[PDB]
Design a protein around this ligand. Structure first.
Ligand code: MG
Ligand code: MG
Lengths: 236, 51
RNA sequence: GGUUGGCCUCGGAUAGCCGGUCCCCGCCGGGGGUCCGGUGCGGAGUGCCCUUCGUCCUGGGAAACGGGGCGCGGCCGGAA
RNA sequence: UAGCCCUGAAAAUGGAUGGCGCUGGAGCGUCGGGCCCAUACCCGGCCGUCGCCGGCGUCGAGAGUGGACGGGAGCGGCGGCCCGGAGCCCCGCGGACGCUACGCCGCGACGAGUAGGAGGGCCGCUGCGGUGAGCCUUGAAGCCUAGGGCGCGGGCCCGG
RNA sequence: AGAACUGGCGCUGCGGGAUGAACCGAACGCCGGGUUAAGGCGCCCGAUGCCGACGCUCAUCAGACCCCAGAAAAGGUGUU
RNA sequence: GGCGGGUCGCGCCGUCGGGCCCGGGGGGCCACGCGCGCGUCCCCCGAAGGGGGGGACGGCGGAGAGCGCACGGGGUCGGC
RNA sequence: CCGAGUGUUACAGCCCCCCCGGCAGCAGCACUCGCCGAAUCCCGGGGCCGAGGGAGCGAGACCCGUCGCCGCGCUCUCCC
């Protein structure tokens, strides 16, 4: 299996034409001429009894619902969320100081690390300057500040992913006794592994931070608007 | 009614020549651009090699 | 209902502002020479707080007034 | 001579470039680039009307804009010892909705209205012939209702 | 008062003319987004809060936008 | 002896036009049975009135198997 | 003696205009030549508002029409 052999210059236009591609593919010498399991039978198991039982499984349904909706009308390409495309703004390169706008943090300044497979850009300001763990944040809820730090070769744990950062609930009790789920008081003590693998990235973001003259005082601070300070008059 | 002039491949259902008219005007305005960027260099290059 | 306050010259505009030696008004104010700045930088397109997450460990620079006060005691300025 | 301004230029309730006001214009003339919003125009939804239709093939076996048999002659192709021949579905016995034809569906264009004229009314009132093996003293009619709804409306249904 | 031609009002809402039968745009099923016409854009009142252009004009009764709602002959070493 | 109208040949212009062609000495093409024979054209070998080539053909002699993708594709889903 | 402001005649001893011959090499350009533009035209990014509504000629289909039209890729040959 060769590669595409026709590089797209613009989205969905090949660089080579129809007859230019008949020769790049050598189509002039490859025109061609040459030209269910329902169920294995189950055995008898019995006296006065033969005929290893007939081919039947996955039988007809017990109950047809009284009415049904018709089938849908097929549409083109509306592929689910695991398959669309992932995008960034050009102002957010790895190493960018971000400004969180909307969380529980609300103005804490963090360091952008890696853009995950879901568009949620993984980020941490360190836990010693801020109080920000390795949280995901959404892309369009930050502000890319025009200062950077080179963290191009920091390290990255492969185990931290979209499946790593999730939230969990498992509804066992169907009875309306007065427990609050019996385990949603549990602020998460799964931190025992999360406390290990932030130190494995804290230890080598901070020497990048401590090499800039006063960048670490800049990350303890929070962002605010005060009196004559207007965005659109402002350079972030 | 999806719009011609705004998406491709509706034009190509109405006009197949619209695609080959379109990469011909993308191939040439890339080589008219590679010519003019190099020529604007080619004056101030030896004008700097003078200085 | 609001998301920090500015605690103040008079004014001129074919002109004004600052700093200033000298001789006149109970140790302060009136004048002129002189030095300044001026599409006002001794610029409310500005200024002081400040964008203060807190604490501990822990060294420098800066600072010898302490800063909030339920303090107690005093005075004297602001009547449109 | 002609532009602006002034004189000519006097009316009775207190008064009207609409007012407040306006003089490096918020006046007049000649222009510019922005900008504002009609039920008008464009795109989309939904309602009705009108025009041109579709589907009785519920035909999961229906397949036909050309069609068969079976004989006179030729192949490419399916199984060779260069001679060769219809298989009716079945290892699954299965396969949504529909079509009150006075119904259902599709597409397109249109929608001011007095006097007036037609149509539709499962709008409503009273009584009759049929009909609901209707409803009710375990509560009918009527009336009332910050109760819940439906219909574009006429109105209607339910709760108390 | 009475005709001609065409459009309107009467039978017709809506945007502008402050106000309104007839003027100027435009005709109307119930809405959402876009754009405009006539007309505007100091503040009532949406929009010039453009670093708009060029001139003319001072009134002790200035002037200010179709129909439309106030003026003539004559005159001014008032200014252009 | 001058001036217009129609006609011919001369050299001169234009990214002329005929896909032109005809032979000779990189970019583009929705243009693809080597075997050879059906018409038609062309270039050729010495002849002198034959053959061999290539080209294009709207005719015939040379002349299937669709597999698994992706999609500005018959009016949005998410297996967020 | 220099510096400065006026008034005069004089055509280089600041310059400016009209010619008679040239080069870099020309950009509708170092935001005034802004012109008029696109078979002489494409690319990319934002903001808003809406998402209305049994397609299987094939398999005799079968858990479950990712289907037509359109535009593409790879393999059913090899090598680097
Ligand atoms: Mg009537
Ligand atoms: Mg008119």
């Amino acid at each position: 299996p060769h590669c595409s052999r026709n590089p797209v210059l613009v989205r969905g236009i090949g660089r080579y034409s129809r007859s230019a591609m008949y020769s790049r593919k050598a189509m002039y010498k490859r025109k061609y001429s040459a030209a269910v399991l329902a169920t294995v039978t189950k055995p008898v198991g019995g006296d006065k009894n033969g005929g290893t039982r007939v081919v039947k499984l996955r039988k007809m349904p017990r109950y047809y619902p009284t009415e049904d909706v018709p089938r849908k009308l097929l549409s083109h390409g509306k592929k689910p969320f695991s398959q669309h495309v992932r995008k960034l703004r050009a102002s957010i390169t790895p190493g960018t100081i971000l400004i969180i706008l909307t969380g529980r943090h609300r103005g804490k300044r963090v360091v952008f690390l890696k853009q995950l497979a879901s568009g949620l850009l993984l980020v941490t300001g360190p836990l010693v300057l801020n109080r920000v763990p390795l949280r995901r944040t959404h892309q369009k809820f930050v502000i890319a500040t025009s200062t950077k730090i080179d963290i191009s070769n920091v390290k990255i744990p492969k185990h931290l992913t979209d499946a790593y950062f999730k939230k969990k609930k498992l509804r066992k009790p169907r009875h309306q006794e007065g427990e609050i789920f019996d385990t949603e008081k549990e602020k998460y003590e799964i931190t025992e592994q999360r406390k290990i693998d932030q130190k494995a990235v804290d230890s080598q973001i901070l020497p990048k931070i401590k090499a800039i003259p006063q960048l670490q005082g800049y990350l303890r601070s929070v962002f605010a608007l005060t009196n004559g300070i207007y965005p659109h008059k402002l350079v972030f | 009614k999806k719009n011609p002039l705004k998406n491709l491949r509706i034009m190509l259902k109405l006009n197949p020549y619209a695609k080959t008219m379109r990469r011909n005007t993308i191939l040439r305005q890339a080589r008219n651009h590679k010519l003019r960027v190099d020529k604007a260099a080619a004056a101030a290059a030896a004008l700097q090699a003078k200085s």
